[PDB]
Amino acid sequence: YPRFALEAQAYGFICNSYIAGLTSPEFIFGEMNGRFDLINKALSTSST
Amino acid sequence: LENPKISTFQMNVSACAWYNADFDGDQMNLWVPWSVMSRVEAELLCSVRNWFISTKSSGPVNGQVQDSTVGSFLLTRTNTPMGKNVMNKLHAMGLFQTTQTDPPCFANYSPTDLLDGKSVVSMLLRQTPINYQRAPTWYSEVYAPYMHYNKQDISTQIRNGELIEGVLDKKAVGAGSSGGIYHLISRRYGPQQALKMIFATQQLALNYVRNAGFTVSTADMLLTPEAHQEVQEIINELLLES
Amino acid sequence: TKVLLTEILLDPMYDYAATVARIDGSIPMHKPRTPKEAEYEFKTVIGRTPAELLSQKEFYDKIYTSKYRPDFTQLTRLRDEEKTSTLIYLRAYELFLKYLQNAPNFNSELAEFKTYENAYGEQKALLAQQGFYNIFDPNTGRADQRTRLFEYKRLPISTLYDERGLPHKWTIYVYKAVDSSQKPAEIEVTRKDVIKKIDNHYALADLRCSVCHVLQHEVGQLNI
Amino acid sequence: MLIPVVCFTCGFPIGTYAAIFDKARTEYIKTKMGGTLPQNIPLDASLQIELKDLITALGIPMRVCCRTHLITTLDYRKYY
Amino acid sequence: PSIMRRLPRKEGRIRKSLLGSQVWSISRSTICGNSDLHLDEVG
Amino acid sequence: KEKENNQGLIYSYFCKICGEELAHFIQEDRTADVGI
Amino acid sequence: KIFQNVEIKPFLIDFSNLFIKNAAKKLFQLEEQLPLVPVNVVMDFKGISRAAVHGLSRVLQDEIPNYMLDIKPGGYKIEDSTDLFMTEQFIRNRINFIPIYAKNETLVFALRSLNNSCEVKTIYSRDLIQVAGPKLKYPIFNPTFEIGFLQPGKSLIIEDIYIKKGIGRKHAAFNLAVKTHFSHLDIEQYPTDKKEYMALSGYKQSSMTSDPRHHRLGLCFPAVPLPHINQAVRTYLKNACRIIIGRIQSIQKIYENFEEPQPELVLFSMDEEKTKAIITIKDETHTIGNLLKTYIYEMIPDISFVGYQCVPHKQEMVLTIIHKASQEDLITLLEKSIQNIIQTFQILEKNVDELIA
Amino acid sequence: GWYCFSWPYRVDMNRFFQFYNEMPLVKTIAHNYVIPNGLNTIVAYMIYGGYNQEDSVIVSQSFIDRGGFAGTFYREEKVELESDIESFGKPDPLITKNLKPGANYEKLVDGFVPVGTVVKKGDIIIGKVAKIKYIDRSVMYGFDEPAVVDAVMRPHGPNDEIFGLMRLRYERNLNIGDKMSSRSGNKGIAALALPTSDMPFTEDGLQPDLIVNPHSHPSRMTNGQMIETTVGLANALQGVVTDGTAFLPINVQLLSERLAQEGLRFNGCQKMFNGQTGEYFDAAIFIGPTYHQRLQKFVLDD
């Protein structure tokens, strides 16, 4: 995405569903949120 | 387990709520008390019946999980895609051949007589009659405009153990459901009696599915071509406002 | 003698030379069962007695050399394929033995045989294909490109706002009778009143805005 | 390491038509391969290699499991 | 190595030998599902 | 070694006359190896 | 006439295909059909409960005695087998699952493969030499199997390959029949191609209510000689019948000894003149239990309860029968039901003998 | 899977060599560079007795006996000597001291157990005594499951001295408690082993190898596993292997219509019967080939 992009897709808006498949930028944004689940799950043991 | 090829610690799935356990590869310790003093206290204090009611949230811990929650819904459902949800005498007796409780009496039934799921559930709840009346998880006003709910499935009522109407699901038989069926049995008949009814009602739910079936497929997830155009037309409105 | 035998019997070079000797029958196909058979295998493979290996100084000079000397110049691509496999195996052994002995004119022949074995590997990979299929698009003549992905499209502003500039609030459900005899023909209810006024004799036709009172499917009749 | 003697699912004697199914398949691929390197066959994006009629001619029934295991089983001789 | 180094951390004297314990007559294995067992029973 | 094992790992010897436990052996102490 | 309209069809190689023809002719020099071929048999049953048909199917699948090829301990000669990849486990797993049609338990084979070449040599099943027993006038297994493969300069010597008998339930190598069809001909079906009905089974009656008594069952046998197919399949069918009868007769020896204290039969006298019978039999499957429940239910329409609970982790079948009669009358009814089962399978025997010429 | 193509030449610790491997019916571009590891097990997505609840699976016993996910598991024993103090040999009861209770020294041959014999718990696999009359520093096989001595050798270490190397092999089948997984990350533990006559079967005779709970999907949204079953079901009948690499153009609506063109249903579900009772389900069950892989977590070691 270009610098100072205005479209909502550039900021994590995934327009597609799982049954229809995601594109490369949508999968990267999904991995950004998916990695947080793995990180917070690890912290949910030690920090607790 | 007399089978020499079994090396695992097997337990009921409804007992996982005590340990926050699942069967993805978890390992659990087990030691058998041998001292008389420790063996006495295991039976009287540390028995799992003493923690059917959570000491944390003051509510029940155990219930139906993932097959007797949907199994109880199908069993207590009023209408089946193949007509009314009834069964003959032979298949009504087959639901009680695994519960390990004393069988009911089916002598007042011809082989061609039909029994609905409410009657079958009632014969098991007569042992511990309770009073319950709530709205099941099946009913949801989110789904209401786009669904034709059955008026006999959105009101679960039990008086003196007789399931008058409604379906049994997470609200009534689910694990951790405060005020549920097994919470009322424990308060009136003891936590050990509630555990036996969890197992007993689990078998009817599982025995019903033995020939009713339950599956998930890829077409269960596929929008129709006309509905797909409606989904992106909704998303285009969001991108238009954005 | 024991330490020498233990060292050499664990050398993969010894096992490979022993396999080559077994192929043409210089040593028995079965591994030795008695020390005499082991000594005979050592003498045939290494080429020197363990007693006399400690007396002199070389080691690689007299290791087995296959009996049949096929013509590897037909490995120049030129009952042919199994013979080619046999030539590949024999030349691999001969070149490995030359590498051990630091034979002159070695790197060029190594490169030539590596090219030959790469061609043989191409053939072997041809033999190792399960197959492949592509779901062709009937309209085209190649891999299907049709997808159910989202495609952006600038909808008219009439879909979000009415002719007075207010936003739409689609919150009235309009139900029409499946059969004609049922009356009334249509019922307009709110989400709270669906369970109390709608039965299976009705079907959801369209939504309605609670502000401008227009059907969602008739939103295009507004002047943009 | 080879095509199983019997189907893993039901136990139909797949193995007795295994070897033939291997070799014959190769020529069929050679018929449909086309100006392409062997190791690039699963990336051609233009191939239509169908083995339905070959397995049918072998006499194997139209069972999903049997044809799956016959087609998809790797051979250790072809990689080592 | 020192005497007082044995105390502090998790693998120390207090948290590994006193607050915790290695015991005999104990078993461990992977758990499994069995719908024929009661909730108060273990296979 | 008449009985290779009774499927139960034991670290102790027993008397052949009555069965009483004589003593137990797990590992050699091996601490006198550092002498003077 | 319970069992009528049977049809038998072998599974043969189509030599009209050039690829298969060339491959077979250059591999095994094969130009005609193999000595042993699979056979699909479709059977129509009328006036019989689905419990009996399904029990017959189960017995033919993995409860009928069957023969395999096994290696005696010490047969795999480590002294001579120099191959590093053809381990004993792999090779014996290959050998156990070769479908055989044996005549006696005396045949002993041997596999002696020597690789004097420079290329990997494939060990087929035609390299199994019979070394003990009477000489075979007809092969007992197909010669086109792939037992293994030897690296150059390697060997594989295996002796004492004998014929072992067992039931398919204990080990899958004794499995006999593979399922190919099962349907009820007295129940109508929806067209499931339509999207309205594709989520349903298809039958117009729910299994909770339907009681079909006209079935079609089709089973495939993996190895049957070409010139004696009708002789083999018939035998198989007949065999199954005897097995079931035999097992049923075992229960018939329990009820006959209800006076003496017997561990496998327990009788209680409940309230309201009700009697209870518990029959616990070890190493029984759902076949016998389902047959017993179905025939007791048919014999006593107004029975209070009947169930055949077969427990996986207990390896036993517990049949509970509660009825409002006395102990003697209940035992009489149970014996009558057992006799009904016996006569039904005797009629099946007779129909099998009558149909397949 | 095939953990190494030169496994017989190696003496490795805790290594499993699965005999049978299959290329997935829906393969990817990653299989152009590495060997696939797993089998195309026929999987039924159904509720069957409640033994597959809470991420468990039901495994056909016949599939286990035929070699499904079966292989050999290896362990090694590396024992060293003290130069001129210790030695390899069978001890004698009347001279050597503090022999291990309940041991079995009779299986030793010249200090090592011969290759091909079965060593069980309590057996002395390596004989070793230190000369003081003698003290017994023997090595005993302390494992519950019996092993087979696969390879014995006496190499020379970096210090030019003999040490004992023994390779023990274990015949491992798939048993209850072994962990399996799909390619979508839905792992599971084998819970029940049913015979070939107790598994459910379709009208056409198809029966599952694994029975997984349908409740494993909705919370984890592993849609690629369900699409793989739909695509792979048509590939088997069509006799083809297709590519399912990520980010390739797919249309599940078109893939579902491809099933009907092959004689199946649009949804891929089929009429099935209960193997224990012979009673058909009142629902078409989604059954098809899904590529499953055995994770190397053995209950016989944990």
Ligand SMILES: [Zn+2]
């Ligand atoms: Zn408006």
Ligand SMILES: [Zn+2]
């Ligand atoms: Zn199959």
